[PDB]
Every structure is written in structure tokens, then in C-alpha cells.
Design an enzyme around this catalytic site. Structure first.
Site, short mmCIF file in Angstrom:
data_model
loop_
_atom_site.label_atom_id
_atom_site.label_comp_id
_atom_site.label_asym_id
_atom_site.label_seq_id
_atom_site.Cartn_x
_atom_site.Cartn_y
_atom_site.Cartn_z
N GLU A 284 0.86 -1.19 0.00
CA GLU A 284 0.00 0.00 0.00
C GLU A 284 0.90 1.24 0.00
O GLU A 284 1.62 1.50 0.97
CB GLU A 284 -0.95 0.01 1.20
N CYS A 318 -2.43 7.92 4.70
CA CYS A 318 -2.37 7.43 3.33
C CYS A 318 -3.66 7.82 2.59
O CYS A 318 -3.62 8.20 1.41
CB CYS A 318 -2.10 5.92 3.26
#
Length: 513
Positions: A284, A318
Site C-alpha cells: 500500500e 495514506c
């Protein structure tokens, strides 16, 4: 049989007092202690150290952790390799059990784990509470997911044969988690391989290694044999590359920046001399997330949605919505309202519940964001914040830029700080165009009363986590699986149904009678 850990409601006085009690417990007892490397059950100390600081008060040492070298990393790989040989045959029930009592230990000390995130990461009270509750969730959910996977999947059997389709453990797993979601992500990307029967070398973010050390200890108390989990914090230069390059490394599970993840993906594919497998990467790699506000919307909701997306945990997520793509009809109003909510909030040390925003994580991070704020004046119009000082802690005001070109650096590159960029569009067609124009596809929000626009966005807004009439920083394990397309990584949906099987390899077993 799963439902999520309720967040602490910080409006009740009975809850506020317990967290206060827990924060002074951490302040006086948990702080300033010394943490060694952990390899094959043995404690290794070095003279060279990583010093973890309070980012809200730069000269309060949270803890000093030992720094590993390439030799320590080498020994960690062998520890995990050797430990894998037995751990891979452990009953799935007795792997899920390690997680279940590790949950129980974290739930018992919930508020003091939360209070340590406050101290180590500069996390506001609600954010730190949410991280711990999310850590709990990962473990609960991945324990239950392994129980289900051990049942196998049905396949067809001809008359006279018994066909079985099952999952086996893979190998050594290098875990490289980020600094921002210091507990949850690191708890989730550590327990997922371990419960699936793999062995772990954990390289926590050197920006925060005390929580990980405390967590490794929790897993040792939970029944983990020596070598299953290995603690080796250090330099990505020496340790990081070495762990990725090692022949015996089977899977790397990585959460962090795009530039590091690209290096990892490229390096891990190179089959080394003596390597007897292909390496799997689970990555990720952050994002550049977008809140689309249509012509026809609830304006309050649009503004509250942009705000929380941009400024949940000082924009250091994120999933953080650094991009406001807003229709021309409602542009000036939504911007007016976002500025009002933003600068009504208090930024300081999280020594109370009412502090909405703490500081950024370190000096390097302070600099980069401050270097990006200069770019926003050249590229747009500063309408809130932009001020920062690093004299007591690494404090930067929540910052809003307006009137951006869709192709501006501030509209394109990951900032990981309390920064939003506004861009005006003149139709919903153009709103999806700009929404889709980054190299990322992690998260996205659409605010609209128009039903056709929701249905269109479901097909046309290309993000892994798409949201309607709310903020884009949701991500609850078992409710909203998390992962993104394009340069946000390999779209491995953390906290969903498919995630454990990514750590495992399918085996087909067939007996002819």
C-alpha cells in the site's frame, strides 16, 4: 461472529477521566525505557541507537531502541526461516489463539496503548483511541478469517476420488510498516502473516519503534515461539534493502511511500542466486485523495467532509484528502465554510480531548511540508494557515490553498501533511476527469444529491475506496476493506475477506480409491 471495537466517546466525563489517568501512567512509567532487538527469542543491544522523541515536545525522550545492522538482519532471516519449519504445521486454531489473547492484552491496556501513541506519534485523543481500536479489530478479524480459511474451499469430486482445495503457509515475511498508523497497520500487517503460518521479520518505522517493541512483547506473551516474530529496527539503507534482497525472504508486506514501494517491488522480483521461489509483494503506497463536490449537494456536509478528510491526524494519512475538486456553482461558499471549520479548531500538544490537531512526526517531515507550502504560493492562493514553527514541537497550522490547476504539483504529489488544495470545475464530467488525473487510486469522496452522478461515479471514479456523502478517511476493518489501484499499490484489501489468502498458497489434494 464479528462486530468492531467501539471508539471511546470523549464527551462522557467517566471516559475523559480514565484517559487522563492512563496518560499520566504512560508519562511516569512507560516512558524513557530501553528496548533491544529481538532475534530468535534473544535480546540484542547495540551502542548505536534510535532515539524516539515526543513530536509535541522535541526533548522528551519516549524511548531509546537499539539499531540493527546487516548482520542482525541476516540472523533475523535465519531465525524466521528455521522457525518456519515447525510453525507452518501449527493448527490454525492455535495460531488464531495467539491473536485472541493478544487482543485481550491490548483491550485490557487500551487507554495506555492509546496514550503511548499520543506520546510517540503526537496523536490527538480520538485519533490515538481509533488506532488502538483498529489494531484490536485487525487481530479479531484476521483470527476469525483464518478459522474460516482452514475449512478450505469445495471443489468437484468424480465418483471414486476425494478432491480437496486447501491453503498452506508460504515462508519468511518481511514486514515494513509506516509511522503514521503506528499501531493498527503495524498490528495488522504483523499478525496477518503470523496467523496464516508464516514467520515475520519486523522492521518498524524508525520514526516510531517503541509501540512496535511493546507489541512484539505482547505477542511473545501470547504464545509465539522464538523466531516467529523478529524485531529489527534500523536504516532502510543497510537493513531494509538487505531484508528485501535475501534469498530466503518469501513475501514483503509494505505500507509507506510510493518511492520506497517502487524500489521494493523492483528489487524483490530479482531472483537471487540460491533463491528457489518467486517473491510476493503486498504494497500500500499512499495516495492523493479527492473529495468531489457537485453542483447540487448538502454544503455543510461537503465542508465537514473535506475538513475531516484533510485534517484527520494532521493530514498524515495514506487516505488523506489533500484534494478538493469543487463545482463552480458552490465553490466560493464551500471554501468559505471549510476555512471556518478549519481555523475554529485548536492545534497544540494533545494533553486534552479538545485538541483536534497535534504536530507532524519529525524534522525531515516538518521540512518537506514546509517546502511544499512554498510551492502552494507559487501555484495557488493561500487562504488559511501556511505558518509553522519547530521550536517546541513540529507544529504546522492546517493549511488551505485555492484556485489550483489540476496538473499542479500540489494537486499531484503526496504531501503527508495538513494541506488541502482546492480546484474549481464547471460540470460533473470535468469533476471526474480531474478526480482521475493522478497516478494514484486509493480513496475518493463524492458529495451530491444527484442519483445519476452517484451511479456514474461507482463505475467512473477509479479509486479502491469510493465514498458518497461522507469523508474519504473511513477504513473500518470488516466494513470497508482498504487498498488502492495504480500507484497506491497492489490493491490488497486490508480488513476484508481476500487478504489472508494473499499470504498463503493453495494446495490441491486428490486421493484415487
Amino acid at each position: 461472529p464479528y462486530k468492531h471495537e467501539p471508539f471511546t466517546n470523549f464527551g462522557i466525563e467517566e471516559n475523559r477521566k480514565a484517559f487522563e489517568k492512563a496518560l499520566e501512567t504512560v508519562n511516569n512509567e512507560w516512558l524513557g525505557q530501553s528496548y533491544p532487538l529481538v532475534i530468535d527469542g534473544e535480546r540484542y543491544e547495540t551502542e548505536n541507537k534510535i532515539v524516539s522523541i515526543n513530536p509535541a515536545n522535541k526533548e522528551e525522550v519516549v524511548g531509546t531502541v537499539s539499531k540493527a545492522t546487516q548482520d542482525h538482519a541476516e540472523k533475523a532471516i535465519q531465525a524466521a526461516a528455521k522457525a518456519f519449519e515447525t510453525w507452518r504445521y501449527t493448527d490454525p486454531e492455535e495460531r488464531a489463539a495467539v491473536l485472541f489473547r493478544a487482543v485481550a492484552k491490548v483491550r485490557r491496556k487500551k487507554h495506555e496503548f492509546s496514550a503511548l501513541l499520543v506520546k510517540e506519534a503526537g496523536k490527538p485523543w480520538n485519533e490515538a483511541d481509533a488506532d488502538t481500536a483498529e489494531a484490536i479489530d485487525f487481530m479479531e478479524y484476521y483470527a476469525r478469517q483464518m478459522i474460516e480459511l482452514a475449512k478450505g474451499k469445495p471443489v468437484n469430486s468424480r465418483e471414486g476420488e476425494r478432491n480437496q482445495y486447501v491453503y498452506t503457509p508460504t515462508g519468511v515475511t518481511v514486514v515494513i510498516p509506516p509511522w503514521n498508523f503506528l499501531f493498527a497497520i503495524m498490528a495488522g500487517t504483523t499478525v496477518a502473516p503470523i496467523v496464516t503460518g508464516n514467520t515475520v521479520v519486523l522492521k518498524p518505522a524508525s520514526a516510531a519503534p517503541v509501540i512496535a517493541a511493546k507489541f512484539v512483547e505482547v505477542l511473545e506473551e501470547s504464545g509465539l515461539p522464538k523466531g516467529v516474530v523478529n524485531f529489527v529496527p534500523g536504516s532502510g539503507a543497510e537493513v531494509g534493502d538487505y531484508l528485501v534482497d535475501h534469498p530466503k525472504t518469501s513475501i514483503i508486506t509494505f505500507t509507506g511511500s510510493r518511492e520506497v514501494g517502487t524500489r521494493i517491488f523492483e528489487r524483490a522480483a530479482k531472483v537471487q542466486p540460491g533463491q528457489t521461489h518467486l517473491k510476493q509483494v503486498i504494497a500500500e503506497m499512499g495516495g492523493k485523495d479527492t473529495v468531489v463536490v457537485d453542483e447540487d449537494c448538502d454544503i455543510e456536509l461537503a465542508a465537514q467532509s473535506i475538513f475531516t478528510s484533510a485534517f484527520g491526524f494532521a493530514g498524515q494519512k495514506c487516505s488523506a484528502g489533500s484534494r478538493a475538486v469543487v463545482h463552480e456553482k458552490v465553490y466560493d461558499e464551500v471554501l468559505k465554510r471549510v476555512i471556518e471549520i478549519t481555523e475554529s479548531k485548536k492545534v497544540g500538544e494533545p494533553d486534552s480531548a479538545d485538541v483536534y490537531m497535534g504536530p507532524v512526526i519529525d524534522q525531515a517531515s516538518f521540512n518537506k511540508i514546509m517546502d511544499y507550502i512554498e510551492i502552494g504560493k507559487e501555484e495557488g492562493r493561500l487562504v488559511s494557515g501556511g505558518k509553522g514553527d519547530d521550536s517546541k514541537g513540529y507544529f504546522i497550522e492546517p493549511t488551505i490553498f485555492a484556485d489550483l490547476d489540476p496538473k499542479a504539483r500540489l494537486m499531484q504529489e503526496e504531501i503527508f501533511g495538513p494541506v488541502v488544495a482546492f480546484s474549481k470545475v464547471s460540470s460533473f464530467d470535468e469533476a471526474l476527469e480531474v478526480a482521475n488525473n493522478t497516478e494514484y487510486g486509493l480513496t475518493g469522496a463524492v458529495i451530491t444529491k444527484n442519483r445519476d452522478h452517484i451511479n456514474r461515479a461507482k463505475q467512473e471514479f477509479h479509486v479502491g475506496n469510493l465514498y458518497f456523502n461522507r469523508n474519504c478517511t473511513g477504513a473500518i476493518v470488516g466494513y470497508h476493506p482498504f487498498g488502492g489501484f495504480k500507484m497506491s499499490g497492489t490493491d490488497s484489501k486490508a480488513g476484508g475477506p481476500d487478504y489472508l489468502a494473499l499470504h498463503m498458497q493453495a494446495k490441491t489434494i486428490s486421493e484415487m480409491f
